[PDB]
């Protein structure tokens, strides 16, 4: 029932790095502090990190399980937008911003970092193991899908798009929010996909892949508040963030068809502001009575 | 999740193989216990409350004036004494929702329902204090139900207008189309659904001033009046919902279409605008014989005869314009056109179906008009007269647009308390009183109309929860022949009413004198043909009620040949969409869609029982889907014989049958006499 | 291929390395010899031609009965005498394309150039014999040019209005909306070009009746008007053409300016509705500081106030509305509104620029109303005020919406004839009488503008072909001294007839006295500054003609004084869009865009080289994109100093320069004193 | 040194099918004859095959298997491109020309034929047969590929050349261009990757794998005589056919760096003539003149 829009919408939201002109962000990155621009770097490499597992690991695997040509080739296109656009796009931001052997020691750091590792390995544990033939561990792969494109970004996307929305950091701002774009319609449509093996289970097995859903979003969700003290409380922004992470955990849940499980909170009005029937002939004698 | 929610949603748990209706009336006391009383605004007396409401520009003071305070004090003492309560949780969440009257900011709840019934009672009886208590009885008894407009609105001065629907005629020119436009608009924000008829509008193709191949046809128009709708959406609250009627003998009449076509290009799609078509007899009579058909341009039609081409019948003249030269037509295929039409309402739901020949054989005021189109929700059914808007700094010759205001009766309210005469009168003349302190001041021709026709509506609820609850199936015959009588019950008191309405004031409806009520034709079938039950089990229902004879019909008719009726048009059946729930019926004399529905408000699920159902009577309460169409349609001419209007006639379609099965069930309609089929909801 | 085009088409074989223009010349002999003599309907005389034509609703009777036939020859004789040739076979081409009378058919030319220009100046007369020769003489030397609407329709019964510049002020009401949107499709059913004010309606998100968050904003009467242009395009003929002009302040700016961004949705975006934006000069002031700016909720500030926010002087009203916390504001970065401008004009041209100060401080009638929009080609600056539209059976009030009366001199053979006195006061009287013929029955605004202004527009052409031919650059010193010296003459001879027909007729343009010319303001600065040509070859160029002096002045301020003045406007230098190819002359005042223009008719390609192109001149006829745009503004400030109204002011753009340097050009326009800028062309 | 160059030509070519208006070919193919028509039709659904397997199949577990983030960003691209543009640009052309009974039909018609069926046997076997880390499997099913890209599709290719070339069809046409287009390139690429496995083996070790890769053609090359005598005979084109396909096989072998093995022959001449603005901020000193 929505493959095809799904394809119309992935298709003309295209875009390429080069399209924006990075430059002019230097201009006000050099006004930034230490910890803000130590933050950014560190939410950065989070992101690219992340988005990395996702271009050759997250949806490539789904691709490969998932049945039918026209799914098939939404998702080869998502792929393609992971590894050929977001991938060289987050490279360009870097490049930008830090010399070389910045970039090259923040890489080092956030590989070591603890809550990031957490949940890389989580999300790529998942994907692993993943077997043919069977629905159930497809649609536990595609939750985590779901969770890391409509949820375990947004604590990184905060940072973008708080300056984006206070008219600092415009450039890659723009860039920050194409992405954010596709990773929405990306979380989207693999919550659709997960939700049609949901809803071909019994009762006692949805019972059973909800409670893997909630466990899986709880794990997550803790480890979420630890990489968020670690980054933001340097900046003085984890409790707005922390707010971010529980308004996108909501969406990943609607998105898997499941209800929101954190109360409605307002958001950061600065990151807000970045934000046929069968023909059949008639055979006369249908004219009388 | 609030307490009541979960009780109302403890109903789908069984419990020993059974639903839990009964857990249904717990969480009303718990929506009541927990949040009705809780967010309710209490006052020392009722006077504080009415002044509160007064000041703070919540109730308008003229209605409240007429009456002392010791009037208004023994009204709300009347409507209290019933102990009304909501025997499910849909109902009051639907009244403290969408009907009861909250603060400013939307906070607190200022009007309870026993509040507003007796406002609205108060403004329904215009300063008599014994009519407000008999209106404050029949709606706390919810015997009668106002419409939507009525009574959300009556007696509040940030209302808009108590008329729910509005028919315009557009004549074939650019200043009457604009005027449509803007008549659309201000009917719009006024928050009525407005229907116009496109039929008089030349189609593409046809010369503006001896330049041919010039107009847009009907479609630019759609196009208009679609943005119109878009623009005037009730201060952004209701989506502004309009109608277009096209004649299917009209040229444009396959782009018409073409609107509601799910690949029809953005130049031509048309979203938030109904389409309706008016088929005649003859479209039927051409598609029937397989013989290839014409359909015309207005225009030329209109040069060669001075008239417009659904001004005059098309039985009649349509040989006469396929042989005429001097008029220009295309050939088309009337089987494919209505396969088409069955394709599009299998897609979409549309268009709207309207029987022409089928509305004015029975028609009683063809004199001044003949019926060329319908309302919004296709039960509305009267004649209409073209407005002739000229140039600015000319004079405008005001025609008739229709405008009928709305109220149902509770069919299974009405018949247990035995009291189809006195809820049929006092319904009449609330409906009266809407129509007289109706006064739009943008729309002259729909001003004219409603005080020259006095055209109101009075509509049935709760036919199917009545049979139901009463352990007789829709599609049976017994249902039909309780329908034929208490309908013809509703209509015999209604035209007494009405002709007693005429007698009390003096006056008839304007041209009531060509009329069939004036030349006694209306009641021939009635005092010829005897509507009692012809059911040992339905006359004992009508048990303790004087069914009347044709000795009755024929007194009544004596009667209003001797003091005319007051109105031109008084029964039409609304669909009556979410004042049912409010009221515990099922949705108009339509069968249930459901048994029990499930409808997402906020984050949260709600489960609504239909009225009364319960393990005895499961069955009875058969879903619509899984019904005969066939059946219902009988039902609903057996129906439509007693209502002078339409009714909202909604096909109820299996996704297994073709477009075939959705013709053979129109052209069943057609030949069984229905006026009007509003929807093909396909399940 | 016919045996012209493939002449024209050997314009670019160049021989000696030099273009064969004189080919062209040739061509012409060919259209004649080939196509036009062959397809042009021949009469025995001029009686049985005029007999024909007016029998056969070509003509009009009314205004050929003023005359005697022997007038009426004597008229086409002196037509006829100058045996007129075109010296292009695109003049030629153009009006028996455009403009020549054709048979309903279509297929032979009823009209030559000088039976057009005879019935022209027949119309122009009014039954004057010797006028009607004085204006044969005037339109055959090609010394004035009627607009495209005057010069195709008078004195032609199928015909559509004179007049195709239209301004409307839109009120913040419904009833005001629906009325400008159906003055839009009426004046675009008469063939004119409309532009609206949406400035007075309030943004989106403000109150209807004390309900917040209501409004769609000025972006859904965009829709509607766009939807409304669409639907009037001339039967079918041209697309609807249609302006909507806000203030820079509103808050719908961005909105507004987003109906024209490519990534903008359906529902977002106008495709022809072109739009304007108006800037004031406070808020050039606040991007110079870099302070941020405030757009207004125009329904806060006229509640607070009783006046609309663009009817105040927003100078000295932006402080108290920032510092009133009953007026909404959003908090803008209008550096950033300015880079979007740019952006967007890059993009599309739009939107066209209106500098409100630049254009109120030479304002003469900012008593009856300061300069507030301007029309679809953004030179009309006139004041206006708006209509309030009341509901049906209510009296209107009705305001003033612009129309002024187009007409352009040919600057060239204007000059070359030594006749700019003569030629500005028969075009003058001309206009007048178009504007005394014109009645329009459904613009009740626009009609009451149109009796009491009195106001035209006399624009001029050829400038840049007058200048390439003079061996003149149109960025020279000389150019701009002899831009000076001939609008000063032509502002001089056109107040000169105003205040003569005000003292034949007895009347002036109601509320003269409070304009300018009355208290003698406006002739300030040429009571003191002298305009004669600094540059002795301008001054040689005005040779054998009176250049006023201040002492000439003086006794024009003298006698407009003691007359008065008839016309409120009397100079707009309109685009002159396919005029310029009849009269053989480049379009405007602006500098040409290519030398030699490629165009496809048909199949077949054709060549057009600027008028007077050769080898000598080659290099002074420079394209409009390789010059210093800061050049082209200093002469259109030149020109815009002796224009009571605007000037149609195109930016030509490279595709090197990005939105900086746009916004440079603009920022130096609003310095040196530009009205309105009319579109950014990328080359 | 080759694949940045080779991601920016890819990204460069990027297309969709609606940016092409079919209509225009509505009367062009109505005056084909029957058999004409039916040959079209069967060409191109053998076409939509292969993209289909390319896109699902082939690029994705290439680009699984082989190392290096912007390697594997092209092949994710050129994956894309076979499923979500190629193979649906087909039913565009099939659905403004043919109805939806002859359109259900061809599809049917893909499932029974014996040499399509063959030949995606072939190839799709050689793709499912690549075992991680082991170089020699990962070489074979390159060759596969090269021969889809490079070899296989140009009996499909033929006959949309063949009517461009004499101005029909020309819309068709213009879109079957841009495929072959982008196919030139991708056989191109996935070769170079086949030579670098092919020049690490011991002279033995390549004289096999020449054995196998012509070995395969010889087999491919047989089947694809049999598919195209059944498909251009009723219209009188088989020989003419096979001159292009041997002709564009010696394309193949060159693009894996061995030796032409057909004889060069004329190949029909009709087939042969078948083939925002910058934005700069404003400074204080642009508001004063
Ligand atoms: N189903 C209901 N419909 C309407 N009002 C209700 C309903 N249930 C409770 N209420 C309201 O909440 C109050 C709670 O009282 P409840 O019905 O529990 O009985 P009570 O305290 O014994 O008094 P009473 O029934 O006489 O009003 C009611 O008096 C009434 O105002
Ligand atoms: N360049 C031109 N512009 C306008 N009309 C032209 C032109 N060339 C020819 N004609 C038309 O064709 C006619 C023939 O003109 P031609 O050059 O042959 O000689 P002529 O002496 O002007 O002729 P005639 O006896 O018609 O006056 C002209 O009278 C005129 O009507
Ligand atoms: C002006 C206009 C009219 N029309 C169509 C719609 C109207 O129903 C129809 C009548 O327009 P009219 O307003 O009646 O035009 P008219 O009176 O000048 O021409 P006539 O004398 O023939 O009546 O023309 C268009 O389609 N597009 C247009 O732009
Ligand atoms: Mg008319
Ligand atoms: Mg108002
Ligand atoms: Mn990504
Ligand atoms: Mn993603
Ligand atoms: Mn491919
Ligand atoms: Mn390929």
Redesign the pocket.
């Given at each position: 029932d929505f493959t095809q829009m799904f394809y119309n919408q992935n298709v003309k939201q295209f875009w390429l790095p080069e399209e924006i002109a990075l430059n002019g962000d230097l201009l006000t990155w050099k006004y930034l502090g230490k910890n803000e621009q130590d933050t950014y770097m560190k939410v950065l490499a989070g992101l690219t990190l992340l988005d990395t597992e996702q271009g050759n690991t997250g949806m490539p695997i789904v691709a490969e399980h998932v049945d039918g040509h026209q799914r098939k080739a939404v998702l080869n296109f998502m792929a393609m937008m992971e590894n050929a656009v977001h991938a060289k796009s987050y490279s360009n931001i870097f490049m930008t911003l830090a010399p070389t052997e910045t970039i090259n020691e923040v890489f080092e750091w956030v590989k070591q970092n603890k809550y990031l590792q957490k949940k890389a390995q989580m999300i790529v544990g998942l994907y692993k193991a993943i077997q043919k033939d069977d629905e159930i561990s497809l649609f536990k792969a595609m939750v985590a899908s779901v969770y890391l494109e409509s949820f375990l970004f947004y604590s990184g996307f905060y940072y973008p798009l708080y300056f984006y929305g206070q008219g600092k950091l415009m450039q890659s701002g723009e860039i920050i929010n194409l992405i954010l774009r596709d990773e929405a319609i990306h979380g989207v449509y693999v919550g659709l996909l997960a939700q049609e093996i949901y809803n071909k289970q019994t009762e006692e097995k949805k019972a059973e892949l909800r409670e893997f859903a909630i466990d899986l979003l709880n794990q997550l969700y803790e480890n979420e508040l630890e990489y968020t003290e670690d980054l933001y409380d340097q900046v003085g922004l984890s409790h707005d963030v922390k707010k971010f992470i529980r308004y996108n955990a909501n969406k990943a849940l609607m998105n898997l068809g499941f209800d929101p499980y954190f109360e409605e909170e307002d958001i950061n009005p600065i990151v807000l502001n970045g934000l046929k029937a069968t023909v059949e002939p008639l055979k006369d004698d249908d004219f009388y009575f | 999740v609030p307490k009541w929610i979960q009780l109302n949603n403890e109903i789908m748990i069984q419990k020993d193989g059974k639903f839990q209706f009964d857990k249904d009336?717990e969480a009303?006391?718990s929506?009541?216990?927990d949040y009705?009383?809780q967010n309710t605004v209490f006052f020392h007396n009722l006077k504080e409350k009415l002044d509160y409401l007064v000041e703070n520009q919540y109730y308008e003071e003229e209605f409240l004036s007429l009456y002392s305070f010791e009037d208004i004090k023994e009204v709300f003492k009347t409507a209290y004494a019933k102990?009304?309560?909501?025997?499910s949780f849909m109902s009051?969440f639907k009244f403290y929702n969408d009907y009861a009257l909250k603060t400013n900011d939307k906070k607190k709840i200022l009007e309870?329902?026993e509040d507003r019934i007796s406002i609205v009672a108060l403004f329904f009886a215009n300063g008599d204090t014994e009519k407000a208590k008999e209106y404050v009885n029949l709606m706390i008894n919810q015997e009668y139900q106002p419409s939507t407009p009525t009574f959300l609105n009556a007696g509040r001065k940030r209302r808009g207008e108590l008329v729910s629907c509005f028919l315009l005629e557009v004549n074939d020119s650019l200043n009457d189309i604009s005027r449509a436009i803007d008549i659309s608009m201000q009917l719009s924000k006024l928050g009525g659904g407005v229907s116009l008829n496109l039929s008089k509008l030349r189609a593409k193709g046809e010369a503006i001033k001896d330049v041919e191949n010039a107009t847009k046809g009907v479609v630019g128009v759609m196009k208009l009046l679609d943005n119109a709708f878009r623009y005037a959406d009730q201060m952004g609250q209701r989506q502004g919902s309009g109608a277009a009627y096209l004649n299917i003998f009209h040229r444009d009449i396959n782009d018409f279409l073409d609107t509601k076509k799910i690949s029809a290009d953005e130049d031509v799609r048309v979203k938030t605008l109904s389409i309706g078509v008016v088929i005649p007899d003859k479209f039927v009579e051409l598609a029937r014989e397989d013989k290839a058909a014409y359909v015309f341009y207005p225009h030329t039609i209109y040069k060669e005869y001075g008239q417009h081409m659904d001004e005059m019948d098309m039985n009649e003249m349509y040989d006469k314009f396929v042989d005429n030269p001097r008029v220009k037509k295309e050939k088309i295929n009337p089987r494919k056109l209505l396969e088409k039409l069955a394709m599009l309402r299998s897609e979409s739901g549309y268009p709207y179906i309207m029987f022409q020949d089928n509305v004015n054989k029975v028609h009683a005021n063809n004199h001044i008009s003949k019926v060329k189109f319908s309302n919004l929700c296709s039960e509305v059914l009267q004649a209409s007269q073209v407005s002739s808007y000229t140039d600015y700094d000319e004079e405008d010759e005001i025609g008739l647009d229709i405008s009928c205001n709305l109220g149902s009766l509770n069919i299974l309210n009405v018949m247990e308390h035995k009291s189809i005469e006195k809820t049929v009168k006092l319904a009449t003349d609330s409906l009266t009183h809407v129509s007289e302190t109706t006064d739009i001041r943008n729309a002259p021709a729909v001003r004219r109309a409603n005080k020259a026709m006095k055209s109101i509506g009075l509509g049935a609820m709760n036919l199917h929860g009545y049979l139901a609850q009463n352990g007789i199936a829709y599609e049976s015959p017994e249902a039909r022949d309780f329908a034929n009588t208490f309908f013809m019950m509703v209509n015999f008191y209604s035209i007494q009413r009405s002709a007693e309405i005429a007698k009390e004031k003096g006056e008839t409806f304007d041209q009531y004198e060509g009329s069939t009520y004036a030349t006694g034709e209306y009641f021939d079938k009635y005092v010829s043909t005897d509507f009692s039950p012809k059911y040992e089990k339905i006359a004992n229902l009508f048990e303790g009620m004087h069914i009347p004879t044709t000795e009755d019909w024929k007194k009544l008719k004596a009667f209003v040949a001797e003091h005319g009726m007051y109105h031109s048009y008084r029964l039409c059946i609304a669909p009556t969409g979410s004042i049912s729930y409010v009221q515990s019926s099922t949705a108009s004399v339509m069968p249930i869609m459901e048994r029990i529905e499930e409808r997402t408000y906020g984050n949260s699920k709600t489960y609504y029982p239909m009225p009364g159902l319960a393990s005895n009577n499961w069955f009875f309460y058969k879903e619509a889907y899984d019904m005969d169409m066939f059946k219902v349609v009988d039902m609903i001419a057996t129906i439509q014989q007693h209502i002078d209007q339409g009714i909202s006639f909604t096909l109820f379609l299996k996704d297994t049958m073709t477009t075939r099965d959705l013709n053979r069930i129109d052209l069943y309609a057609h030949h069984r006499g229905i006026k009007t089929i509003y929807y093909a909801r396909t399940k």
């Open positions: - | 009336k009303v006391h929506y009541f216990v009705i009383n102990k009304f309560r909501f025997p009051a309870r329902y």
